[PDB]
Ligand SMILES: Cc1cc2nc3c(=O)[nH]c(=O)nc-3n(C[C@H](O)[C@H](O)[C@H](O)COP(=O)(O)OP(=O)(O)OC[C@H]3O[C@@H](n4cnc5c(N)ncnc54)[C@H](O)[C@@H]3O)c2cc1C
Ligand SMILES: Cc1cc2nc3c(=O)[nH]c(=O)nc-3n(C[C@H](O)[C@H](O)[C@H](O)COP(=O)(O)OP(=O)(O)OC[C@H]3O[C@@H](n4cnc5c(N)ncnc54)[C@H](O)[C@@H]3O)c2cc1C
């Protein structure tokens with residue numbers, strides 16, 4: 001006769017978003033089980049996005065275009081600040097950001113957040129480009145995820161490898177599921193979101209003591225970035241292929257990325273030559289984006305699913321009673337290129353929805 | 364002081380092709396270690412093709428266009444015949460195959476192989492289509508692979524999960540590697556084959572005691588097939604998206620596949636209605652194809668790799684001595700839609716190359 005918890009939650013997805021949601025829910029006292037295909041130990045898996053990020057904090061919208069985005073970014077920055085002392089985050093001082101025009105600098109909304117924010121002289125920008133410098137924060141994407149996972153372990157969360165094809169499979173002994181499935185949200189019956197889209201990112205992992213972060217959007221026909229991370233490693237990138245699922249390495253893209261990046265900062269080379277760059281790995285990830293922006297909202301759903309709820313529902317088109325429970329589905333996906341830098345704020349919004357839902361339905 | 368084998372081989376890839384190559388090499392006495400990202404237990408992994416096949420024997424070329432293909436298919440048929448008694452293969456009697464024209468029937472080259480081969484009357488074909496019927500063989504694709512894996516275990520082969528980015532990582536204590544990597548052949552340094560391309564296949568797994576196989580290519584704008592497999596399951600398919608990497612389920616494609624398939628044989632429905640079809644799973648696999656056809660050939664390679672051998676070579680563009688061994692790389696990939704049905708013959712050609720190479724180089 002043991003007192004048992006009535007605060008059970010399934011988190012579907014183990015990328016940085018499910019992990020951070022899970023961690024805040026667990027700290028709040030929820031009993032959390034994580035169900036996912038891809039787990040933090042799968043550091044070279046291409047079927048989720050989280051191993052492949054920089055990951056730094058680089059705002060991409062105006063306050064007006066991305067009010068939630070900015071709120072989430074601002075909150076995650078404070079958290080990363082708190083992680084510098086133990087090394088789970090790293091200052092990228094004197095980051096330089098180059099854009100085509102004043103528009104590309106997004107109203108400078110974040111200037112009070114990133115220290116030493118200031119405009120660059122045109123002597124310190126590529127030709128025709130405008131620029132600012134500031135100090136921002138970075139995490140080692142796969143290690144940061146494993147760190148979150150350890151924190152979850154200690155709070156008693158559990159992990160289970162599973163690939164779900166229909167919602168009832170996730171409502172596994174719980175009446176609330178957190179859906180943090182990235183691109184998978186499109187092909188799971190009960191979610192079916194056609195708006196989910198990938199945005200392909202190829203990068204080159206480079207061995208280099210280069211400690212400066214440079215980003216250049218001033219050339220539409222060649223996005224370039226250098227993002228340092230702990231371990232004497234930098235990530236050189238350059239692609240944004242919207243709707244592109246190709247997982248294979250483009251050899252021509254290798255050269256365009258390294259040339260542009262070299263341009264940006266020859267010290268990523270052993271001798272300022274393309275040929276002096278010490279390549280560790282060629283990488284391709286697909287950012288899990290969504291037309292209409294990230295989806296963070298709670299929905300009420302009746303189970304089991306019928307073919308009129310989902311084109312992908314299992315069994316025969318004809319469905320009826322055979323019970324019929326109602327559960328809560330809290331969406332958290334389609335963060336595109338900003339999942340790490342928005343992750344802690346997003347998880348905060350997620351846990352507020354869960355608190356909310358439990359107050360209303362589940363007791 | 365123990366006598367040790369000098370017949371070591373690494374098989375890179377654990378799809379039906381690496382598995383079958385591995386099995387014949389092991390039966391020949393080779394010591395075989397399999398290195399691969401995706402293993403036979405990963406039955407819902409979309410990063411290799413082998414879990415997703417029918418898999419039946421359906422020749423797709425003329426003798427003139429695909430001489431090796433036909434040789435390999437003919438050989439695999441005899442092997443599958445030998446597997447019927449233990450259930451690792453299943454007769455699909457009275458298979459029906461519909462094409463647009465006489466051309467689509469490929470010269471009837473295989474008529475002595477599939478029993479009871481004969482033309483269909485136009486009364487038994489869709490409108491405007493021509494057809495033959497014959498008895499062919501099918502295997503349960505993921506279970507067949509696990510079966511091969513058990514046979515490998517008993518012959519002492521071992522398996523290890525690994526994702527390779529450069530050839531020297533595969534030449535792990537062996538001087539011969541079998542490269543059976545499907546699409547991965549394009550992005551591994553030392554192979555770099557730009558000709559590798561995926562061909563997307565969406566299907567619907569259906570619960571049904573339907574035991575007949577029907578295939579209809581008479582409609583270019585909608586390929587359709589019904590392929591029974593052990594367990595009261597049939598696979599209904601329809602896509603061939605060349606160069607398409609999209610791993611998400613197309614809901615519109617679901618309906619087009621089920622309607623066409625229903626057309627072909629209403630008994631896949633519980634009541635001959637789309638709504639009576641008992642859906643088990645929606646699937647998407649990418650067939651590992653190659654412009655210029657499958658590659659089965661042995662190549663001699665010097666290690667370590669330099670950036671002039673591979674655009675993707677690791678380290679700095681500048682490379683030299685630091686040793687320099689020479690090894691054998693036996694290619695076996697780009698089987699597209701015919702990897703299972705060509706698999707045993709392909710593996711036979713593979714093991715002959717290995718025998719050859721060992722006679723020449725490795726002793
Ligand atoms: C090259 C590159 C550069 C980037 N750099 C940065 C950067 O500097 N800063 C920044 O903030 N972000 C960056 N991003 C985007 C960041 O990678 C993504 O926004 C973030 O990883 C997405 O997190 P997620 O948890 O939403 O999704 P995905 O990581 O990481 O997780 C989807 C989770 O859902 C599971 N899934 C869905 N399908 C199913 C199902 N059917 N069954 C079971 N589980 C399933 C998956 O297995 C995985 O567990 C980068 C990405 C890329 C490719
Ligand atoms: C819908 C559908 C229908 C089909 N039906 C049939 C049919 O009826 N009959 C027929 O014959 N065939 C069919 N096919 C094609 C058959 O599926 C493929 O031809 C066959 O699976 C390919 O076998 P493979 O071993 O070449 O490649 P892939 O299965 O199965 O294996 C690639 C192996 O290489 C490993 N790999 C490569 N990248 C790397 C690396 N970098 N490091 C480590 N390992 C790595 C992978 O992880 C995997 O182990 C079907 C396919 C599809 C999608």
Ligand SMILES: Nc1ccccc1C(=O)O
Nearest residue numbers: 060217223238239240337
């Ligand atoms: N928004 C981005 C984020 C990262 C890399 C590129 C882009 C881009 O628009 O091209």
Ligand SMILES: Nc1ccccc1C(=O)O
Nearest residue numbers: 054058201225237337338
């Ligand atoms: N999210 C980013 C932040 C900075 C540079 C690149 C990226 C990227 O997604 O590619």
Ligand SMILES: Nc1ccccc1C(=O)O
Nearest residue numbers: 423580586601602603700
């Ligand atoms: N050659 C094929 C094999 C299987 C399915 C479709 C095709 C096709 O040409 O459309």
Ligand SMILES: Nc1ccccc1C(=O)O
Nearest residue numbers: 417421564588600700701
């Ligand atoms: N290889 C096949 C044989 C028969 C029907 C379909 C396929 C297919 O690849 O889709």
